[PDB]
Design a protein around this ligand. Structure first.
Ligand SMILES: [Cl-]
Ligand SMILES: [Cl-]
Ligand SMILES: [Mn+2]
Ligand SMILES: [Mn+2]
Lengths: 183, 183
């Protein structure tokens, strides 16, 4: 059926210009591949606070991915992941913002560091949540587990750990192998 | 998993140059949208006889549909669909020709007239068969009914009827709404 997918990307102080660009490229690639499908998209940059770069209505109005993200500016601040996730659940997934009523909700969280805040993401528990942890900040198994709480279960399918930002290209390659025209 | 898909397109005399071109356009549109996925394609033109325009190996070596179908010459003869389907079953789905051993076999038959031969297609029965009947030769319930025996069950899912070749543009729009990234 319909799929309303939200990209919640890390814009923290740790990211180098090229790394931030690779995150933007990844989001665009998936969007272009899935253009003219039953998917609709929204994008929110998060660091210390949260900013919807374009919401569902924006995408519907102008499907152009490159145009939708042409305005993004790297925040360069903290990594308040609990707040960011709750922000999507209540401020982005809204009918008035273009979200479709009984559409399946999906969240693709991309981050390069552990969350600097805490609390709960209970309000977002019914959204299908994928998280992509990139870079040396996720070298240890300990740091990787910290991401499970944000993603759906099992972690084996929903939590993806990438050692480099270059690997985002590999991940896109792999996701395309999972694309099918369903009966 | 892996999907080996063969397009079997009508090259009969009834087809005008632009109608035959729209059939090719449909095939290429499909292939382009499904590029870099688990799908691999082969195309066979049929009329009085049959011709593999490119096989699975060719597709793999040069994944460019436009380049893959540039030499196609409209046969302009009859409509031997029974023989054609049997040819795909035994002369196209072959590992030496690029077909993957246990990939799901799918056959997309595109035609604008009733078969001019008879027999059976028992040998192609394990292949998921879709048939697209286009035009004036299918304006009666009887003519449309004859297409059923070539496709998988139920006909309501595997038989597609288009009043015009223009409609192949519509059909492609429709099928894309069924494109999803599987878990
Ligand atoms: Cl950081
Ligand atoms: Cl004909
Ligand atoms: Mn960071
Ligand atoms: Mn014909």
């Amino acid at each position: 059926g319909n799929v309303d997918l939200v990209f919640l990307f890390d814009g923290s102080m740790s990211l180098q210009p090229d790394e931030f660009q690779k995150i933007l490229d990844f989001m665009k690639d998936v969007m272009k591949k899935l253009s003219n499908t039953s998917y609709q998209f929204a994008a929110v940059q998060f660091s210390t606070s949260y900013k919807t770069e374009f919401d569902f209505s924006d995408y519907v109005k102008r499907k152009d991915p490159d145009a939708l993200l042409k305005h993004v500016k790297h925040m360069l601040l903290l990594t308040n992941t609990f707040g960011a996730i709750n922000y999507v659940a209540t401020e982005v997934f809204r009918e008035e913002l273009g979200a479709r009523p009984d559409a399946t909700k999906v969240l693709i969280i991309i981050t390069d560091g552990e969350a600097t805040d805490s609390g709960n993401i209970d309000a977002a528990k019914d959204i299908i949540r994928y998280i992509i942890g990139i870079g040396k900040h996720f070298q240890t198994k300990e740091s990787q587990e910290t991401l499970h709480k944000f993603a759906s279960k099992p972690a084996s399918e929903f939590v993806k750990i990438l050692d480099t930002f270059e690997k985002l290209k590999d991940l896109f390659t792999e996701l395309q192998k999972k694309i099918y025209v369903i009966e």
